[PDB]
Design a protein that fits this description.
part of a larger assembly, 2 chains, A: 53 residues, mainly alpha, 0% strand, rod-shaped, B: 49 residues, 2 helices, toxin
Chain lengths: 53, 49
């Protein structure tokens, strides 16, 4: 079952659906880790995500 | 692989950033000496982690 709550049964379709989903979870996770590190490095200091010290 | 005390290090990274903003030299070239040093050391701790 994908992120979109739809089901996939065949091996040639699951491996392609999982490839979209793992690709979808990384770019969500990078949006998370950016906002975490933006929240940390605004507190402690250093380069933010935009490049602003 | 003998001995690495990052408690002595991640303090020392943080104090360099702490002493960067703290310094009161009143001169314009140490003010971009330390800023270039400290922005390395903060990024050094990040890039090590």
């Amino acid at each position: 079952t994908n992120d979109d709550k739809e089901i996939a049964v065949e091996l040639g379709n699951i491996l392609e659906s999982m490839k979209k989903d793992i690709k979808r979870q990384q770019e969500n996770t990078q949006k998370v880790k950016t906002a975490v590190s933006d929240f940390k490095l605004k507190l402690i200091g250093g380069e933010l995500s935009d490049g602003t010290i | 692989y003998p001995e690495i005390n990052i408690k002595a290090m991640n303090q020392a990274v943080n104090t360099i950033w702490l002493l960067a903003q703290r310094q009161t030299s009143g001169i314009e070239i140490i003010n971009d000496k330390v800023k270039r040093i400290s922005a390395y050391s903060r990024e050094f701790d990040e890039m090590m982690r």
